[PDB]
Symmetry: C2
Subunit: 187 residues, 2 copies
């Protein structure tokens, strides 16, 4: 048959073609800049309302990852987004790329820096504390004892409407529907 022993297929989420469900959810991030890198804005987290991010930006890519500094996230998933960032912004008219984890915003910023992010103008590493937003869209990953990390997923939002949304069935090892290549194919 199509799906053999214990295999699973990553499907498109029902979120597609609906309004981005920002609610009152907020994320934190710390800016990064190659000019004035010692400013307070590049040291301390700031809070962003998901609703404001979406209303102020016509085209937004969002991708979730289970754990800052973990192998699959660090080596196979996120570097592609950083590599294609200039092309996304300059050729595909992407305004913001948001990388979402439940990790603290200092760890997220250090991760971004380790991955070669020099400037957060068009890319931000967002903290979703307690997995609140990610659980709200059903893209969470249970890791035991009531603790949730983000799953691995990607989303495209255009003019406030979700045009692409899909999560991995095996987030620990797979980078497929969440890959920058699959996102590029849906822009």
């Amino acid at each position: 048959g199509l799906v053999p022993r214990g295999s699973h297929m990553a499907s498109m989420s029902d979120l597609v073609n609906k309004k981005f469900p920002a609610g009152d959810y907020k994320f934190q991030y710390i800016a990064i800049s190659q000019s004035d890198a010692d400013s307070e804005s590049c040291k301390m987290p700031q809070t962003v309302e998901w609703s404001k991010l979406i209303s102020e930006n016509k085209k937004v890519i969002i991708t979730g990852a289970p754990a800052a500094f973990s192998p699959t996230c660090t080596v196979s998933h996120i570097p592609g987004y950083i590599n294609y960032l200039d092309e996304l912004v300059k050729e595909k008219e992407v305004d913001q790329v948001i990388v979402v984890t439940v990790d603290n915003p200092f760890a997220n910023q250090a991760w971004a820096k380790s991955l070669g992010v020099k400037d957060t103008t068009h890319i931000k590493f967002a903290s979703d504390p307690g997995c609140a937003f990610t659980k709200s869209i059903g893209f969470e990953l249970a890791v035991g004892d009531g603790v949730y990390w983000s799953g691995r997923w990607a989303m495209v939002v255009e003019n406030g409407i979700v045009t692409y949304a899909a999560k991995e069935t095996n987030p620990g090892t797979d980078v497929t529907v969440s890959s920058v290549e699959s996102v590029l194919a849906h822009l």
Copy 2:
């Protein structure tokens, strides 16, 4: 008076002179080694029962920090423990130094490496998922919306008995009772 406007004093916890309350709590960490650094044990987290750590080690120092990679934790708090590690182990008969955060174990390991930890034989950066253990001893830090980080604190456990335990009143900025210097004064 002794305590003026909005000031607070860090006191000794009532935990002192009582058995270490390990319960069934567990932590995760990833080992670090300068020989065989590419082994699976240095890539993937392993689980340790707090009860086993304490029963197998006569003298254990435990210190909690709110956020891997955050400024106070990274610059002022943890480096002292790493700096004194050899002295603690060789002169003060310390068997294990455990640095506790609620951060994922990959981020904790990367933090430890960034801080110059070369080997986890006597020092381990532990993950306390969801702040479960730290909340159980009342050393947590509320950060909003039901999310808890560790506070900043230190503890000494000798033959299964807590001999020192104290948390900061202002963990974001203060490193006093949680400092390696205060721990050294209570060994």
